[PDB]
Amino acid sequence: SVTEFLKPRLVDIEQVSSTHAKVTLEPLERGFGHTLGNALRRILLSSMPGCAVTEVEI
Amino acid sequence: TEFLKPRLVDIEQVSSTHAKVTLEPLERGFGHTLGNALRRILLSSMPGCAVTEVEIDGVLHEYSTKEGVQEDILEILLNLKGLAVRVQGKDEVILTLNKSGIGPVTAADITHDGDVEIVKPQHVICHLTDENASISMRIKVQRGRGYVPASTRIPIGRLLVDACYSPVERIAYNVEAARVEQRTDLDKLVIEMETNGTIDPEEAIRRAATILAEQLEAFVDLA
Amino acid sequence: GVLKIVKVYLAVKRRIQPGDKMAGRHGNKGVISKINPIEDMPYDENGTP
What we know:
By secondary structure, chain A is of the alpha+beta class.
């Protein structure tokens, strides 16, 4: 019983144009929204593998 | 490019109630993310064993008062609500207490049971002052999460007492530098939990990890 | 004109809730606007919210 927690059901995947998406999840328990949101925000913004231009010379 | 997975390097019991665990290795940024996520998840989503119902023999309704005990009934329920117990297995369980004679009525003299264990016997429940005065009571206990007052969950000797199901009361996370390890920037995350003794550090941290892992796995696949 | 009257004393246990009116002692009134979880509150350096 204690282990049970309301799992979300992935609902919104609204993909405005080709790159701007507005996902929504619900219903989460009291406060899980903030903790998941902040965790995802920090991990996405801080640590995401990728490649970008570093040095340029003329 | 690799992400060093963390591990629970140590669990030192500085004191009976509060303790500290250490997570290592962690990489830059991950430190504060995990620390805050674990503090937030631990401070709410945990199982407890707080009392829920009390039935005193010679007490009709809560606002009355018994004899031979200086504490009013409301103070008795307050202390019982403050009582901490470690219960395994059985979902809910009944305890008995029929101490008689002058003196403290600390939790130690609560009737013995099986997997139920009173973590802090010293915690006073009430007092006795009259020699031929006995306080006989049945204390129900279930397990739950967060906070569930009397009214929301709602004989006449069934005194409802607000739940306080929570084992932890203060979670603080710090991030610091680790050994050289042939690689700098590895963060040691020290998480101290001040718990009422009902839950050990390892069990609590692992349950928090499990709940967060489930919630996030609900994010892994999307439409 | 009354044969008998029976008076019953209800006793209730209110709880601080999101419409009360706490107030300091220097006239600084206020109505409780929300009962946050323990986490959302801001906590000082060594953990205590």
